[PDB]
Design a protein around this ligand. Structure first.
Ligand SMILES: Cc1ncc(COP(=O)(O)O)c(C=O)c1O
Length: 409
């Protein structure tokens, strides 16, 4: 009689997922949800980018388009344009033909494929022992993805200094100095998730130095290019510096946020190598991994991105749309800080504006968060992370005052 699945454990729900359900259930009228995982407008709505609507119309009216399998690595124009976006149009890595691009299922898919490749071809053959370094507090799914790829030794580098509400550069650099040679280091290219604190360009030069000295492999996660600061070139400054300093690396790019195309699963794994012929080989093995995962990737999202990035007018319109998003986020930061200061809230609050991108470590501790959630119906994670786009001109006063109460009490 007993089912073949009878002993399958009910998996634990994701913290963010439970939080938002608890919010929806909750009936008090002042409630705010600062744990949503995507950009929201000043009216608490999703935002389809005008350029996306425009390009979707053009796609729908282009009768030349068929539905035949894309190549295993993906739409050629999307892969070139995507890597060009990250590396910059006059990159030497590109001029010297030592850049590969694998279209992937969002940033998550690019991390996965990259991880699978490394667990098989990097630092030897099938070396699952190579240490993988991730930022202390990091995107939850970094660990899970590298574990799924087979890596058994996943480590933390120091990053968030709760005391000083900022980057522990010395901790970070120290941990990097002690890393076994050839260890993989998962770096946030900009808009650190979930803290919002990035290294400055000068701190990046120091990070790179240690990495170069200890032959560490950079695996960049670039989920926010342009969206972070409104400035595409500045958001890619670290990536381009590592290029200029001769590094070989992977960079997992997502277009979920910067195009608002979350549900079309558009990503690209950029590969930068020393010599061209070697890159051809890497791609050849990327194909094998893709084949046993998704076979080949979906077209619609990649078509939108490719059409946009290859047309200068649409490119301009898109950068405008992105700037709208980064300007709103900047503004809500500036205003949250100004209000907390005007209420003379204990502690410093410059971290709120030193941070960049949609997510902010507020610096509240778990008891303080418990107060906001339980007493004030303001929903955020124990870590004190908020989605800054969940701040609105309507709820700002209430949130600032609630945070003042929390810190004071
Ligand atoms: C730092 C970082 N990397 C990668 C991703 C992957 O997202 P997606 O697979 O939707 O592109 C996210 C999503 O929030 C993120 O914050």
């Amino acid at each position: 009689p007993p089912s073949v699945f009878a002993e399958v454990p009910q998996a634990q729900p994701v913290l963010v997922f439970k939080l938002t359900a608890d919010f929806r259930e909750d009936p008090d009228p002042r409630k705010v949800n600062l744990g949503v995982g995507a950009y929201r407008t000043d009216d608490c709505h999703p935002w389809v980018l005008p350029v996306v609507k425009k390009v979707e119309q053009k796609i729908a009216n282009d009768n030349s388009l068929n539905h035949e399998y894309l190549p295993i690595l993906g739409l050629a124009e999307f892969r070139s344009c995507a890597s060009r976006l990250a590396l910059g149009d006059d990159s030497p890595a590109l001029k010297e033909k030592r850049v590969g691009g694998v279209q992937s299922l969002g940033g998550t898919g690019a991390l996965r494929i990259g991880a699978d490749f490394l667990a098989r071809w990097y630092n030897g053959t099938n070396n699952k022992n190579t240490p993988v370094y991730v930022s202390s507090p990091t995107w939850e799914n970094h660990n899970a993805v590298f574990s799924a790829a087979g890596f058994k030794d996943i480590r933390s580098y120091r990053y968030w200094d709760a005391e000083k509400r900022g980057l522990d550069l010395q901790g970070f650099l120290n941990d990097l100095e002690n890393a076994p040679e050839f260890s993989i280091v998962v770096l946030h290219a900009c808009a650190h998730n979930p803290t919002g604190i990035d290294p400055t360009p000068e701190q990046w030069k120091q990070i790179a130095s240690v990495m170069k000295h200890r032959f560490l492999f950079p695996f960049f996660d670039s989920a926010y290019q342009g969206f972070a600061s409104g400035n595409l070139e500045r958001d890619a400054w670290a990536i381009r510096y590592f290029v200029s300093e001769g590094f070989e690396f992977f960079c997992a790019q997502s277009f979920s946020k910067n195009f608002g195309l979350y549900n079309e699963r558009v990503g690209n794994l950029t590969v930068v190598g020393k010599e061209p012929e070697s890159i051809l080989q890497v791609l050849s093995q990327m194909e094998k991994i893709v084949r046993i995962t998704w076979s080949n990737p979906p077209a619609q999202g990649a078509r939108i991105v490719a059409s946009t990035l290859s047309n200068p007018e649409l490119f301009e319109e898109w950068t405008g749309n992105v700037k709208t998003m980064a300007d709103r986020i900047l503004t809500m930061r500036s205003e949250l800080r100004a209000r907390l200061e005007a209420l003379k809230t204990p502690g410093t609050w410059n971290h709120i504006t030193d941070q960049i991108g949609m997510f902010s470590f507020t610096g509240l501790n778990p008891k303080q968060v418990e107060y906001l959630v339980n007493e004030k119906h303001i929903y955020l994670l124990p870590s004190g992370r908020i989605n800054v786009s969940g701040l609105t001109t309507k709820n700002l006063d209430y949130v600032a005052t609630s945070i003042h109460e929390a810190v004071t009490k």
